UniProtKB/Swiss-Prot annotation:
The lineage of its organism: Eukaryota, Metazoa, Chordata, Craniata, Vertebrata. The gene is SUFU. GO terms for cellular component: ciliary base; ciliary tip; cilium; cytoplasm; cytosol; GLI-SUFU complex; nucleoplasm; nucleus. There is a cross-link at residue 237 (Glycyl lysine isopeptide (Lys-Gly) (interchain with G-Cter in ubiquitin)). The keyword tRNA processing does not apply. Ubiquitous in adult tissues. Detected in osteoblasts of the perichondrium in the developing limb of 12-week old embryos. Isoform 1 is detected in fetal brain, lung, kidney and testis. Isoform 2 is detected in fetal testis, and at much lower levels in fetal brain, lung and kidney. This is Suppressor of fused homolog. It comes from Homo sapiens. InterPro entries: SUFU-like_domain, SUFU_C, SUFU_C_sf, SUFU_N, Suppressor_of_fused, Suppressor_of_fused_euk. Keywords: Acetylation, Ciliopathy, Cytoplasm, Developmental protein, Disease variant, Isopeptide bond, Joubert syndrome, Nucleus, Phosphoprotein, Tumor suppressor, Ubl conjugation. One of its GO terms (biological process) is smoothened signaling pathway involved in ventral spinal cord interneuron specification.
Amino acid sequence: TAPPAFASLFPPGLHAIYGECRRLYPDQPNPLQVTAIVKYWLGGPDPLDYVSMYRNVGSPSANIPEHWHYISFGLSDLYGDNRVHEFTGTDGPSGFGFELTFRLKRETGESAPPTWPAELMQGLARYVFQSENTFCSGDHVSWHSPLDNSESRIQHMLLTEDPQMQPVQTPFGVVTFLQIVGVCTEELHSAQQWNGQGILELLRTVPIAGGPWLITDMRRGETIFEIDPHLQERVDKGIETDGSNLSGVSAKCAWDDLSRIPHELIRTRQLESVHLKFNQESGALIPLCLRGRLLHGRHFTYKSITGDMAITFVSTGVEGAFATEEHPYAAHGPWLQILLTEEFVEKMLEDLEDLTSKLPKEYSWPEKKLKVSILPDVVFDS
């Protein structure tokens, strides 16, 4: 409602973001910042000009922890004179369309916010700029490193809309706010197997993880599923409902013929009977591959990590597949495409209590000439 001091100095882009900040925190008009002094468009390594570091009381009254809030400047068009972003105009997204935020739970000893998350936001922005790929709500980041650089359990990231921050209309476009959320490797794998938003919704329930504002505690030693097993059950139901985002996986697998691009020999062979082979972990993905993908009219690919051999499960819905309901087992080279009808896969699932919820475990369908075997990995090692 009241303007900032020395307003004519601030660029209109930067002005609108700081507008949203002042709204949230009228108490701190001078929050500690991390500033880039060697600018990115001059040769500097850091794409983010400023990182404001606020403090939020939270609502322990409503069971929301006290935490440090971080907000970036640079990902959106701040200056609007084509120095780093092409001037888009008011319509559409400003710059890359968003600025990062992050919420780190306050520990003791902290009279001030740590600065490592600002350095993380730098490295994270380095990807966006060097690849021009744009993140949105639900997207994940395989960081494969403890975020604070600590030996901490939290090694990956999920991206959500910031609960407090409202999208703003700069004279250069709209700017949404994507809040970074730290996650465990296993919780990242869940978000790969199912949508990102649904896993976010799960994290919101568990207050320690967690919480409705998705505050990151780096001290968290166990995953949401170790905190609560009943959540594991709520994932599959979603994979049944929404489907799976995971389109394939590199894993120890093989396929054998039971019949009695490119080479290019100008022909591809079809098979009457087929025998598929998997490990424990790879064979443990079948339910989601079937229930999650084929029942949703999508496909799934297994590739062997050791060498050249692939199996692509296709539903009758896909296009371009060389396997039809009439000749369902078709192979080009060592790439086998298997086509399974919606009626047959429902039957397959009822014959598959795979995760017991001993090897080798074989499954036969003489009615369809299919044999799937789950066996120890020392085989594919050969």
